[PDB]
Chain A
Amino acid sequence: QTNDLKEVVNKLIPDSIGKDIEKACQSIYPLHDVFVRKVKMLKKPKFELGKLMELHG
């Protein structure tokens, strides 16, 4: 929610989200094989090129 798409992919390249959830749910019931199974894309903003060429260096 709080940061942009360049940084959410930087989180999905490890599995920082899955490791964070796994450590958080240790008190309720210890989970082990925790991942973000799938990411889907529903909506994109109207295409920009300057925003693409920042992502391409």
Chain B
Amino acid sequence: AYFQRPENALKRANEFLEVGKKQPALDVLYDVMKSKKHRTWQKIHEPIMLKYLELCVDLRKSHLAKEGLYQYKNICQQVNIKSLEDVVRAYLKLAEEKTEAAKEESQQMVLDIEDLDNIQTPESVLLSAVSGEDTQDRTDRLLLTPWVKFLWESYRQCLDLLRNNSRVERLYHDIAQQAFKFCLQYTRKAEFRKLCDNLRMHLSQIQRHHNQSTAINLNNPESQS
């Protein structure tokens, strides 16, 4: 085994973090979510998943937050779905603030460092100016783009795997709306993929009509609203 009394995962996770090893602190929490302890949502499963998704953000591992939530949605099925709502809202909330900080960081300290640095065109900046553009995009790619390419991959995975149809989620449409407003702050070529995502998921709904899913008819919420 790994654990008896699943709350101990938090204590090992917390102990590893005081040393500053968030990779094995995450390994601990990952091992508990996928084990015998599948008892339909213990009160301690929320603080485990809150810490789990905080460390998934701090290390930038979207494919782990996928598996983590994919296990969680299973162990918090119709028992209580408020837990999914609270967890996944708090996940996307945490990722949004990391990108807010990442821009303001790069855009006030490093952006002023960029046009603090001597612009007086040397050979290395002149040579690249037959293909390339400004220094701010050239170094904002180093310190911002890995965070917005994580926000995108966080949103798309939260939509695609987790909430395919599943009637019991108005959160699905909340995320879709929020991620459309995310495209007004950052890149646009991750918005055509977002449209195609809504198109195929709508196509996936009214082709099968084959699970405890969305009946898109007179139903005001899951058709009009």
In the complex, residue of chain B having the shortest beta-carbon distance to the beta carbon of A11: B19
Report which A residues bind B (CB closer than 8 A). Answer: 7, 10-11, 13-14, 16, 19
Contacts of B193 in A (CB 8 A): none
Q: Is there contact, CB below 8 Å, between B24 and A19?
A: yes
Determine the distance from Cα of A7 to Cα of B19 in the docked complex, in whole angstroms. Answer: 8
A7-B15 Cα distance, complex, nearest whole Å: 12
Complex: chain B residue closest to A14, CB-CB: B15
Determine how close the nearest CB of chain A comes to the CB of B38; give it in whole angstroms: 26
Question: Within 8 Å CB of B19, what residues of A?
Answer: 7, 10-11, 14, 16
Shortest CB-to-CB span from A5 to chain B, Å, is 14
Residues of B within 8 A of A14 (CB): 12, 15-16, 19, 21, 24
Please indicate the chain A residues that have their CB under 8 angstroms from the CB of B18 in the complex: 10
In the bound complex, residues from chain A placing their C-beta under 8 Å from that of B16 are 14, 16
Known: A13-B15, A14-B21, A16-B16. 8 other contacts (CB 8 A): A7-B19, A10-B18, A11-B19, A14-B12, A14-B15, A14-B19, A16-B19, A16-B24
